[PDB]
């Protein structure tokens, strides 16, 4: 997260860190056994880390649970990043509490202008690199689909939306991928891609979660 703020320990209880010997992507807890992330974060041997603030220090509220199964969206295209979403099932159910909690799925899509919270342990520099140990947060608005498409000609599908600031300076970045975009208590987006980070006229692009609720629910119901 570039241009954001320190969230505060366990203030984003649904935020998870996907670990394969090191943090590599974010995710969102949607129930005691399932996490939503980006399909481009897929890899085998994932350990889901819940209740994290500093990802390099054991602070007392963590739950580390290995993934038992990963399900990349059936129509995920890694070249265009269309349908950049995946589900990860935990080998054991997480113990839900005030610091490890699920986030609700949307019942309807969000609208341009709505303010959302984006979070993660990704790069905090728009030029250069610096990876934080504690969770970073950014409040940002969803941008109109027309401005999104104009910013990224030929690249924005109906399964993507832009959020952020066209002037630059505030955005998600490498390492935040797969993480949450929560608006009014609903998980509306997944950190997916963008041109560099926090660049003028190149806002963040996010997977449009509301288009996937039926797939998420039916997948969970049978797995």
Task: Give the whole-angstrom CA distance, residue 63 versus residue 115.
Answer: 30
Cβ-based nearer residue to Ca ion, 55 or 183? 55
Cβ-based nearer residue to Ca ion, 16 or 110? 16
Per-residue interface string for the shown chain with Ca ion, residues 48-67, x marking contact by CB under 5 A: ----x-x----x--------
Active-site residue flag, 73: no
Q: Is 195 annotated as a binding residue?
A: no
3-state secondary structure of 106: coil
The per-type count for the chain, helices as H runs and strands as E runs, is 2, 13
Q: Which residue among the candidates 17, 23, 28, 40 is catalytic per the annotation?
A: 40
Single out the segment in contact with Ca ion by CB under 5 A; choices: 33-41, 46-54, 92-100, 157-165.
46-54
3-state secondary structure of 161: strand
Active-site residue flag, 84: yes
Active-site residue flag, 40: yes
User: Within its chain, how far is the Cα of 20 from the centroid?
Assistant: 17
Instruction: Measure Cα distances from 7 to 21, 110, 120, 156 in Å.
Output: 24, 23, 9, 30
Q: Which residues are at the interface with Ca ion (CB under 5 A)?
A: 52, 54, 59
Annotated binding site for Ca(2+): 52, 54, 57, 62
- Give the residue numbers annotated as catalytic, written as ranges: 40, 84, 177
């Amino acid at each position: 997260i570039v241009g954001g703020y320190t969230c505060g320990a366990n203030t984003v209880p649904y935020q998870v860190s996907l670990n394969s010997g090191y943090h590599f992507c974010g995710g969102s807890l949607i129930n005691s056994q399932w996490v939503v992330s980006a399909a481009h974060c897929y890899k085998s041997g994932i350990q889901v880390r819940l209740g994290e603030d500093n990802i390099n220090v054991v602070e007392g509220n963590e739950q580390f649970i290995s993934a038992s199964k990963s399900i990349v969206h059936p129509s995920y295209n890694s070249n265009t990043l269309n349908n950049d979403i995946m589900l990860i099932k935990l080998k054991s159910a997480a113990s839900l509490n005030s610091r490890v909690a699920s986030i609700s799925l949307p019942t309807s899509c969000a609208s341009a202008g709505t303010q959302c919270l984006i979070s993660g342990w990704g790069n905090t520099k728009s030029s250069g690199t610096s990876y934080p140990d504690v969770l970073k947060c950014l409040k940002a608005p969803i941008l109109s689909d027309s401005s999104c498409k104009s910013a990224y000609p030929g690249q924005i599908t109906s399964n993507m939306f832009c959020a952020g600031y066209l002037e630059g300076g505030k955005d998600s970045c490498q390492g935040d991928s797969g993480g949450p975009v929560v608006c009014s208590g609903k998980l509306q987006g997944i950190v997916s891609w963008g041109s560099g980070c926090a660049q003028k006229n190149k806002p963040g692009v996010y997977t449009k979660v509301c288009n996937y609720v039926s797939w998420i629910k039916q997948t969970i119901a049978s797995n």
